[PDB]
Design a protein around this ligand. Structure first.
Ligand code: CA
Length: 223
C-alpha cells in the first residue's frame, strides 16, 4: 500500500496473508472455512495466515491453516485478469474471534465515490521497494467507470473497477494482490492490477466482487 497508514494490529480481522514460504498475496476471510483472493494469486500449497499483523513476527493471535482446495473462477483469463477471483477452502475451520472475523459479501454493487478500506502488506514505495511488516491501510473512493476505462483503455471489463486517486500518491501495490477492498461493511473489491503504483491517472484495478456473489455462494455451498 502506497501512501496509506499502519492499520493497527488486527483492526482488519478478515485480512489474510497467503503464505507459501513467504507472504505472496492478501485474501479476505468470508466464513470460517473460506477465503476470497485474486485468481492471479493461485499457487499450489497455500497456507492461509489469519490474525496477522506483523507478518514477520509471531505476536500471538495468528492462525496458520493450510488450503485444502483452491477454485479459480471458470472464466478467469490470466492475460487480461478478467474474472480475477478465486476461493480457497481452509483444511480446518478458522477459530472466529475478535482478531479473525469474516467480512460480508455484498448484496449489491457500490457506486462511484463510495469510500473503501484497502489493506495489505504490499510495497509502500511509489518508485523503489519497501515492504512493510505490519498491515497497511488506505481509505480510497470508488472511481467512475469512465475515469477507470479512460486510465486503462481497452482493458477494463464490467468485472473490474478503479478505486483510488487520479492525482496518484495513494494506491495498492505488489504484495497487496488478492487483498480486500471493503466499502460500507462489504467486500466490494479484490486487489487485482494496475499500472505501477500510486501513479497519476493510474488508479488500482479491483475485481468487482458484487458480480461474483452468486458464484461464490453456490461454489462454497457445493464444496
Ligand atoms: Ca505475525
Amino acid at each position: 500500500i502506497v501512501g496509506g497508514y499502519t492499520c493497527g494490529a488486527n483492526t482488519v480481522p478478515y485480512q489474510v496473508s497467503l503464505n507459501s514460504g513467504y507472504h505472496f498475496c492478501g485474501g479476505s476471510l468470508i466464513n470460517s472455512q473460506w477465503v476470497v483472493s485474486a485468481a492471479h494469486c493461485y499457487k499450489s500449497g497455500i497456507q492461509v495466515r489469519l490474525g496477522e499483523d506483523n507478518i514477520n513476527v509471531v505476536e500471538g493471535n495468528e492462525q496458520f491453516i493450510s488450503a485444502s482446495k483452491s477454485i479459480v473462477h471458470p472464466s478467469y483469463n490470466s492475460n487480461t485478469l478478467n474474472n480475477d477471483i478465486m476461493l480457497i477452502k481452509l483444511k480446518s475451520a478458522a477459530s472466529l474471534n475478535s482478531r479473525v472475523a469474516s467480512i460480508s459479501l455484498p448484496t449489491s454493487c457500490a457506486s462511484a465515490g463510495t469510500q473503501c478500506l484497502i489493506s495489505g502488506w504490499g510495497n509502500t514505495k511509489s518508485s523503489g521497494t519497501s515492504y512493510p511488516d505490519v498491515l497497511k491501510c488506505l481509505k480510497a473512493p470508488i472511481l467512475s467507470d469512465s475515469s477507470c476505462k479512460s486510465a486503462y483503455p481497452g482493458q477494463i471489463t464490467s468485472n473490474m473497477f478503479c478505486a483510488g486517486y487520479l492525482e496518484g500518491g495513494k494506491d495498492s501495490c505488489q504484495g497487496d494482490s488478492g487483498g480486500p477492498v471493503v466499502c460500507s461493511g462489504k467486500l466490494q473489491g479484490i486487489v487485482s492490477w494496475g499500472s505501477g503504483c500510486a501513479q497519476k491517472n493510474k488508479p488500482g484495478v479491483y475485481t468487482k466482487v458484487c458480480n461474483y456473489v452468486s458464484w461464490i455462494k453456490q461454489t462454497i455451498a457445493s464444496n
